[PDB]
Design a protein around this ligand. Sequence first.
Ligand SMILES: *[C@@H]1O[C@H](CO)[C@@H](O)[C@H](O)[C@H]1NC(C)=O
Ligand SMILES: *[C@@H]1O[C@H](CO)[C@@H](O)[C@H](O)[C@H]1NC(C)=O
Ligand SMILES: *[C@@H]1O[C@H](CO)[C@@H](O)[C@H](O)[C@H]1NC(C)=O
Ligand SMILES: *[C@@H]1O[C@H](CO)[C@@H](O)[C@H](O)[C@H]1NC(C)=O
Ligand SMILES: *[C@@H]1O[C@H](CO)[C@@H](O)[C@H](O)[C@H]1NC(C)=O
Ligand SMILES: *[C@@H]1O[C@H](CO)[C@@H](O)[C@H](O)[C@H]1NC(C)=O
Ligand SMILES: *[C@@H]1O[C@H](CO)[C@@H](O)[C@H](O)[C@H]1NC(C)=O
Ligand SMILES: *[C@@H]1O[C@H](CO)[C@@H](O)[C@H](O)[C@H]1NC(C)=O
Lengths: 272, 243
Amino acid sequence: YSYAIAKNPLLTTDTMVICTRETRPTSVFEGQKQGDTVEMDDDFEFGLCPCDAKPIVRGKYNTTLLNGPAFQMVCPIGWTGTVSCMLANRDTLDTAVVRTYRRSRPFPYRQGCITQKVLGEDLYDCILGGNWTCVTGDQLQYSGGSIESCKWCGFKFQRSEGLPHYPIGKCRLKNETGYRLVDNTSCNREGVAIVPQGTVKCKIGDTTVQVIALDTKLGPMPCKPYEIISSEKTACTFNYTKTLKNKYFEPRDSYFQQYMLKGEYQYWFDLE
Amino acid sequence: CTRETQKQGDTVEMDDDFEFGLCPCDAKPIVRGKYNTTLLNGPAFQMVCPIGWTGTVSCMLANRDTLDTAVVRTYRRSRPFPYRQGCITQKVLGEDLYDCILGGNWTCVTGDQLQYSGGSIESCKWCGFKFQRSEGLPHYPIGKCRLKNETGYRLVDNTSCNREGVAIVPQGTVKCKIGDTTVQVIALDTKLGPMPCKPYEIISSACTFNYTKTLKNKYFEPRDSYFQQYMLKGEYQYWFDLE
Ligand SMILES: *[C@@H]1O[C@H](CO)[C@@H](O)[C@H](O)[C@H]1NC(C)=O
Ligand SMILES: *[C@@H]1O[C@H](CO)[C@@H](O)[C@H](O)[C@H]1NC(C)=O
Ligand SMILES: *[C@@H]1O[C@H](CO)[C@@H](O)[C@H](O)[C@H]1NC(C)=O
Ligand SMILES: *[C@@H]1O[C@H](CO)[C@@H](O)[C@H](O)[C@H]1NC(C)=O
Ligand SMILES: *[C@@H]1O[C@H](CO)[C@@H](O)[C@H](O)[C@H]1NC(C)=O
Ligand SMILES: *[C@@H]1O[C@H](CO)[C@@H](O)[C@H](O)[C@H]1NC(C)=O
Ligand SMILES: *[C@@H]1O[C@H](CO)[C@@H](O)[C@H](O)[C@H]1NC(C)=O
Ligand SMILES: *[C@@H]1O[C@H](CO)[C@@H](O)[C@H](O)[C@H]1NC(C)=O
């Protein structure tokens, strides 16, 4: 007997006959090509492969949701690629393309798709895709709107008081749960760094802030005192003499290492 | 006198030790010199301590009514007289001992204040205060110092009382001590400068204060209201209250 399954001195044995994509030992239907290359329109989101072929997606990223011969584009924002419908030959193992869904230019913004994703506490933009097909992406920047809180140097702030400016660092809007980048201002303020794990506690507005010194220079602290401790058990005893305005005698207060002067009197303290 | 039987005058050159002279014919001695050293009585005159003295002592003979005067003798000293033995060339004016550029004894012509060359010093008066020892002073001897063998003070140096912006004045604002001496001082400027003395009297003291934790030489904005400076020690900032 003869197999009699051929495409055109010494065949496919198929993919077409158990479909009319292509026409079908010396002594041995037509090919309907219409709709071989389908160009995906700006609003294209659903395609069905002919001859019950499997859709093979060769694109920029994964947006496709496939079921048998049918497939659907889910929020394909900026997606470029091809969706080739294929059928295999059992005896040779080679595959034949019945239809090619092509997208040569990136898809524009699809209406109803969310292009923002929250990763931890930071709100990121979706460079590619949307919804569950979103691909992150550089952190979203603050353009405007009502701010709930601002996280700077690892501390949360809700007021301009005690801060160099406002808003600072990463700030969360009342609209979103995620934080948006506002500034990259340094925590090292006049040789003092605002660090989450520090040496001394101090207050900025209403927030308890931890600080570490970089230099031992006589400089200001970027915060207000955290807690003030009154001696009432440490005692205070001192000696004083009469002097001239800003004129001092040789001894420097042993504990303070500075000439203690007020108006016309010099002081020397002793602390228990 | 040999004027009546030579009317022409005589010439006498004063020697280095010449002190006494007598005018002939009872003539009056007219002294034309550098300064007053002469002690005259009728025709006789005395050169009291002439040290550096140059001039002439002309014996002028006068008649009346005609005021015509003829010189019978001229005592002359062209070169200055050297030091006369027995004459004192130092005069005390107040407390300061001055040198005699010309003359000696009561004929002394004051010169610049005698300077200290050497010898045992009794005391040193500087800025109106007496000092007998080097402690608390910039150097010693200072200003004008009196020797043991003398009564007057000799100039040692010309160091100022006003330093560094503080005046050591006999009548001052605040009392302070230099060695063992009680010194009065006045301020010239209100600059943050040192006092040239030690405290006169130390008075011992209630005292109450507040403190917080801070970083090494790192301060919070409020300066202690009284002291007007950031009270810092190690890792703690202070704020005092004195009631
Ligand atoms: C796309 O396809 C599958 C989805 O599970 C995965 O193996 C592959 O890594 C995805 N591609 C990227 C870039 O994540
Ligand atoms: C994207 O998600 C929204 C709900 O958040 C939904 O209404 C919309 O249909 C989704 N779009 C696609 C293409 O799945
Ligand atoms: C409201 O939330 C949306 C989230 O897409 C954001 O684009 C918008 O800017 C927020 N509103 C304001 C006032 O910022
Ligand atoms: C302060 O007073 C005490 C008690 O009189 C004394 O022992 C101490 O030396 C004094 N300190 C100074 C710097 O004068
Ligand atoms: C010399 O001293 C004064 C002038 O300075 C004068 O009064 C005095 O009579 C003079 N002495 C004599 C003895 O002439
Ligand atoms: C100068 O005074 C001394 C001491 O009084 C005396 O010994 C001396 O003779 C006096 N000399 C003259 C020339 O007056
Ligand atoms: C006092 O001593 C000094 C030398 O130190 C000397 O110059 C001076 O003439 C002396 N005076 C008397 C009166 O001895
Ligand atoms: C010091 O403590 C007292 C009592 O608590 C308080 O009245 C005063 O304001 C405090 N001063 C400073 C500078 O904190």
